């Protein structure tokens, strides 16, 4: 998708079909839908209070 939009005319066409609003709404909705999987405070409190697969 990035390679498709590599030219000025392609970017103008992308704007003229409402692509940018589409991707903004998509980012908002997807951020709402998913839940972060990266470790956090809970996974530090547990490290204290104690390929590489074991």
């Amino acid at each position: 998708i990035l390679r498709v939009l590599d030219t000025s005319d392609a970017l103008k066409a992308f704007h003229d079909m409402g692509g940018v609003q589409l991707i903004c709404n998509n980012m908002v909705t997807s951020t709402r839908a998913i839940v972060n999987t990266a470790r956090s405070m809970v996974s530090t409190i547990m490290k204290f209070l104690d390929e590489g697969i074991h």
């Binding site: 990035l2 939009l5 000025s8 103008k12 992308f14 991707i23 980012m27 909705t29 951020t31 999987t37």
Partner: protein
């Protein structure tokens, strides 16, 4: 890959659209800005662990989309300084964005750089941004007199 797991894929598209060609930047930003909850989502994605795209690229998106109008600049200042929650977010609705997981007013080097870009830049409406910053400082000082 983080693109499929996370929602950072769309932010990369937005960054490319805004910053691929400087000529197209203004009208990109004008079309992108009026979307609801966009700034809060971008800020929440910025103040998160590295999830696919480095922080400097996100700062560029936040700066460019916030410098195209006075209202958007004030909204960005407010969300960065005092209220990072999603606007119009009632918990009763199970589809509206919430973004409840971050404490307000958290500061990182990226946020400091964004505020410095917002303030130091010279363009019409920068006086409104300076007024907003001074108003926030005054409000914080007044609240500090809780005794």
């Amino acid at each position: 890959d983080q693109v499929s797991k996370t929602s950072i894929g769309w932010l990369r598209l937005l960054h490319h659209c805004l910053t691929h060609i400087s000529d197209l930047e203004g009208m990109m930003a004008s079309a992108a800005a009026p979307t609801a909850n966009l700034l809060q989502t971008c800020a929440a994605l910025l103040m998160s662990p590295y999830c696919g795209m480095h922080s400097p690229n996100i700062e560029v998106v936040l700066v460019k989309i916030g410098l195209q109008s006075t209202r958007i600049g004030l909204k960005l200042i407010d969300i960065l300084l005092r209220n990072c929650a999603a606007s119009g977010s009632d918990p009763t609705d199970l589809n509206s964005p919430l973004l409840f997981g971050r404490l307000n007013g958290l500061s990182s080097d990226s946020t400091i750089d964004i505020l410095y870009q917002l303030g130091t830049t010279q363009d019409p409406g920068t006086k409104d941004r300076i007024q907003a910053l001074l108003k926030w400082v005054s409000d914080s000082a007044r609240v500090a007199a809780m005794k």
